[PDB]
Amino acid sequence: RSGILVFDVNETLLDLTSLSPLFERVFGDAKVLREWFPELILYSQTLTLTGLYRPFGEIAAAVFEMVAANHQAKVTPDDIAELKTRLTSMPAYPDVAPALTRLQDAGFRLVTLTNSAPSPAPSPLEKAGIASFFEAHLTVHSSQRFKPHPSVYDSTAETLGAKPEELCMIACNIWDTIGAQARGWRGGFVARPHNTPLTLAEVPQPDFIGRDMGELADQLIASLTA
Amino acid sequence: RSGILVFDVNETLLDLTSLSPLFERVFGDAKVLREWFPELILYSQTLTLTGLYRPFGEIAAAVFEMVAANHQAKVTPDDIAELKTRLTSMPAYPDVAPALTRLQDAGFRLVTLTNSAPSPAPSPLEKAGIASFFEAHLTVHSSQRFKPHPSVYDSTAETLGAKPEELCMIACNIWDTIGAQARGWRGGFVARPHNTPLTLAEVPQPDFIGRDMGELADQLIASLTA
């Protein structure tokens, strides 16, 4: 009815800071999370630019091992298993289910789009208890390229039988919203902890912005009556 | 005469840790450098994937402001000017000039290729006293795309009048070497402190790998007669 809302999963719906204890233990410093995460995103975009594809979790593991090496911190097979456990089981932010309920009440169709590879059941969203809010769960698999590559958004729009104008990408990552907006979608930014929007000339700013998912849901619903 | 070696400049030749005091002052923690830098690279590649371009130093200032906001750290115009000054005046590692001397004396042609926009003279390489080793100094600015986009390497080979088989990309980041190797060039990785190589199944390994510039030069020179 009101449009289609496409949500980034990792960091946006599900809380990345749940990984902090792994970094605290391995590195003696939970802040190394903020080093490792942009390196993972960087390498995913690098493979994409160079015409290579490996599943996101494989890149996550390799980047963890590299960051460990960069800090000279010891890493075991058990640590890599733990990384997998945590990365695939990040809990939902507690503002999410409430916000999605109201967006659903307002007639918005809700979809997920993730860099993560299609997962066997139960998925991260199923574990977090929020999967059934969404009519589709899409990933970069069919594109074999990572965000913000144009093929990801175009294939998503194609799969959903939707025009770019009907779509809004929702994320706490400005790189994800820019990717979608470059393809003529709208963008909605949600400002999670340690995530503020990048501001740079010539770079489209989000259409909607909220300090949390509740606030974002508010202005998305409000935009219907304006 | 023995091949052309193309060097990444930032981090590889010139020492990024010279920026630590600015991070120590603004964030109360010099280690925030290791968060800001991959964010900068991430965003450079995100712009490239979405068909946008701003000079590297401008992206650097925007990411500094974003990372500062993510830490609730105050930023002033002085801080931003100091970032530009330091980013354009990093000193050469002590192992660089001896290695370039050995490489040049062994017959290699030497070139640089950087994400950084061209400046008036003196360039950072000129300031650091090592520009004279190189026969050409190239940047991504004319491509309006950042590494590792194929346009950057391809245009570089074109400008030099060289075939991929004649070229070797030398960097302390696997993303740069991957970029060049995808275009048929050779790759040489030189470790720096806190820069070790990513290893990922499928992804081609560098042709040469050194723990420092001297060891990398050992391998490059050894390859001439093996």
Residues in chain B whose C lies over 2.5 Å from the next residue's N (breaks after): none
* Least CB–CB distance from A63: residue in B49, B198, B203: B198
- Contact with chain B for residue A187, Cβ under 8 A: no
- Cβ pair B14, B124 in contact under 8 A: yes
Which strands sit side by side in the sheet containing B136-139, from one edge to the other?
A: B136-139, B109-114, B4-7, B167-171, B186-190, B208-210
Helix (H, G, I), strand (E, B) or coil at A201: coil
- Contact with chain B for residue A6, Cβ under 8 A: no
Among the listed residues A4, A8, A3, the one whose alpha carbon sits nearest the alpha carbon of residue A146: A8
Burial profile B1-22: b = 16 or more Cβ within 10 angstroms, e = fewer: eebbbbbbbbbbbbbbbebbeb
- Cβ pair A204, A182 in contact under 8 A: yes
Domains identified in chain A and CATH numbers: 1-15+89-226 (3.40.50.1000), 16-88 (1.10.150.240)
Neighbours of A161 (CB within 10 A): 8
The whole-angstrom separation of Cα A59 and Cα B89 is 33
B-chain residues within 8 Å CB-CB of A148?
46, 49-50
Pick the residue of B31, B33, B40, B45 with the most A CBs within 10 A to test the interface with A by mutation.
Answer: B45
DSSP letter (8 states) at residue A163: -
The whole-angstrom separation of Cα A105 and Cα A107 is 5
Contact assignment for B49 to A179 by CB distance below 8 Å: yes
CA angle A95, A97, A101 (to 5 degrees): 115
Tell me: cis bond preceding B148? Omega within 30 of 0 counts: yes
Q: In Å, how far from its chain's centre is CA A133?
A: 16
Which strands sit side by side in the sheet containing A4-7, from one edge to the other?
A: A136-139, A109-114, A4-7, A167-171, A186-190, A208-210
Å between B104 CA and nearest CA of chain A? 30
Burial profile A65-86: b = 16 or more Cβ within 10 angstroms, e = fewer: bbbbbbbebebeeebbebbeee
Sequence-ordered list of residues with C-beta below 8 angstroms from that of B137, at least 6 positions apart, any chain: B111, B112, B114, B123, B125, B131
- Contact with chain A for residue B28, Cβ under 8 A: no
The whole-angstrom separation of Cα B114 and Cα B8 is 6
Which DSSP string corresponds to A93-131? PTTHHHHHHHHHHTT-EEEEEESSPP-PSSPHHHHHT-G
Q: How was this structure determined?
A: X-ray
Q: How far is CA A224 from CA A2, A3, A103, A220, in A?
A: 7, 10, 11, 7
Nearest CA in chain A to B153: A50
Contact assignment for B52 to A201 by CB distance below 8 Å: no
Pick the residue of A32, A45, A56 with the most B CBs within 10 A to test the interface with B by mutation.
Answer: A45
The whole-angstrom separation of Cα B83 and Cα B70 is 18
